Structures are given as structure tokens and as C-alpha cells.
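Hallway conversation turned thread

IA: we were arguing at lunch whether anyone had actually written out beta-lactamase end to end. Turns out nobody had. So, for the record, here is the sequence (360 residues) and right after it the C-alpha cells. Reply here if something looks off.
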Amino acid sequence: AKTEQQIADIVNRTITPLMQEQAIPGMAVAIIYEGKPYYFTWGKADIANNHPVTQQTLFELGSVSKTFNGVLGGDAIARGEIKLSDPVTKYWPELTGKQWRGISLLHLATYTAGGLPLQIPDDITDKAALLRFYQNWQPQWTPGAKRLYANSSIGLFGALAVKPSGMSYEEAMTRRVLQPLKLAHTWITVPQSEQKNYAWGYREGKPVHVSPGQLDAEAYGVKSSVIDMARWVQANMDASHVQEKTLQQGIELAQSRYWRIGDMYQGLGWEMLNWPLKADSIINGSDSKVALAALPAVEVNPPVPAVKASWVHKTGSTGGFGSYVAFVPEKNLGIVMLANKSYPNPVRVEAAWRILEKLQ
């Protein structure tokens, strides 16, 4: 049984050189070891004003926001509000295009709709334009044939998933996920009172914050602290302690395996690989050459319920931030790596692997 100081030594040995080599101003890392949280912070959250990273520093999670999306969707399924088999047109009747027939909420959630684009076009700045965009989108492949990671896909899933609730995505997320899990330092919109804790992201040494964009909250707009992310990992790793029934069930549903792409399985937001595994699979898999590629999707029907012997993870980036979260339910082991500089995904994964390999 490792002591907090022994874990600290392991973490620092990897993070110190990482920050120096990648020129990362500040980082916050959470380690879940034997189900218990351990926090670590380094550097600056704000260079110009010389403010350090603290346990309350808020980092832009980028696409790790998709895991919150998936869980909220799972919760909606558990509430009987939506079904993954429901057609997209049930929630957005205005999508009359014939190309939308046969496309389900599952397809949107798992990037298997047929090639929806990675990004929603920048020229789209209003609801009307967003409708035209989806209406005129032409599928590149038939539903379920290929997986193409895309913000426009899961972003739409999140927006439609909360429609029956009658709440906005932000309100639904806050009331159904953030508050029940006591994530008091997790936000889609950082309030004025918490701006003092909002770290600046850095690109080319310049401070920057993510700009507003269509379906941003749903795909890449959540901000959170190291303490809240440790709680998020614990809740997703083992939801047996989660009191709210539909949330507990929603968490489990987000880790069901809906498709197999090579050796990776697609959940709702979360991505999974069988455990044990070898470093190359996840490191190489995180390179954009693989992560952003259009690959054949093999349907898992019926979906396989959450497998404890899995490496569950998600990468996330914005212009000024780079994040990574990974956990292994079988081992009650996990890690959160938050940084206020975006750096190569494979570098993040390799660092996480070296650390957890020493905490087996």
C-alpha cells in the first residue's frame, strides 16, 4: 500500500520533466489509488499575474466534456425520456431530409451517423443556420458503417437528449449530474465569482480562453477543477455509491460497448479498451492519424454492459488546454491530467501510462 508521499514521488518524476519539455505553464493531476483521491498541482494558472495552480483552479476540459454529455444522455435513457434506438427526427422533426431516415440517437452519440463533420462550420452562428447545416448535410456512408469522431455528431446528441426534460443542456447537466455528484467547481459557464480560479490557457505563450461556438457545451465546453475531476473519475469508475438511481444507471450506460473499432470500444463519450493492455495500443490510438480517421465500425448488438476489466479514457483539447482522464475499474485505479497548454495526445497518454504502471 503506497503512502501519499510515495505516490507523490511517482507522479512528480513524470510530470516535472513533462512540464519542462512541453513548456506547460501549469498542471493539476489527480490520482485515484485503491479508490482514494490524491491531488497534485504545479506551476502557474496565470503567468502575467503570477497566480499558482491550486486545487480550485478551473481548466478547460475540451472533449472530456463528451463524457459528461454521455452520462447525461445515459441518465435520460434511465429516466425513460429517450431511447438510443429513437430516430433523430423524433426529437428534431424539422430534419425532413431523406438522408436522415434510419439515423438514430445512438448514431449521433457514437459518431456512426455517416460522416457528420469534426467541426460545425464556423460560419454557423445562429439556430436557423444550424438547421440548414444539418438539413443539407450529405452522408458519406450508410448509418452504422463507419465511425468518424465529430463534435457535430455527439454535440447534436446532447442537445436532443435533454429536450424531453424541458431544460436547457446547461440546466439539465447542472441539476442531474453536477449537483448530485457535488461537482461544485465544474461549469459550462464560469460565473463571475469563480473567474479568479479560471486559469488562462496558453498557445504560443499567449493567454487564451475558448470562444463561444455552436453546441460547444455539449462537445468541448466544460471547465473543471482537479478535485471535481477526481470525483468524476471515482463516480464513473464505480457508481455503486451514487445515490440517484438514474444517474447511477446513466453512468453505467455510458460505458456499455456499442461498437468495436479495432481494439477500441465506443461508449457514450467514454472510449474503452480491454484490460490488461500494452502501452502502444492507447498511445498510438491517440495520435490524430487514428483518432480522427474514418474507420469501419463493428456493431455490438446488443451492447455489452460496462466491462470492469477495461481501460476507460478520454482526451480533450481547446486552443489553450490539454486534458486526459483514464481509469481501470478492475483495479480501482485512475488518473486526471489537466494542463493549461495543449500538447500532443500521445505524450499525454504515454505519461499517464508510465505513472499508472508504477501504481499497479
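OS: looked through it. The chain has one domain: 1-360.
IA: good, adding that to the notes. The longest helix spans residues 4-22.
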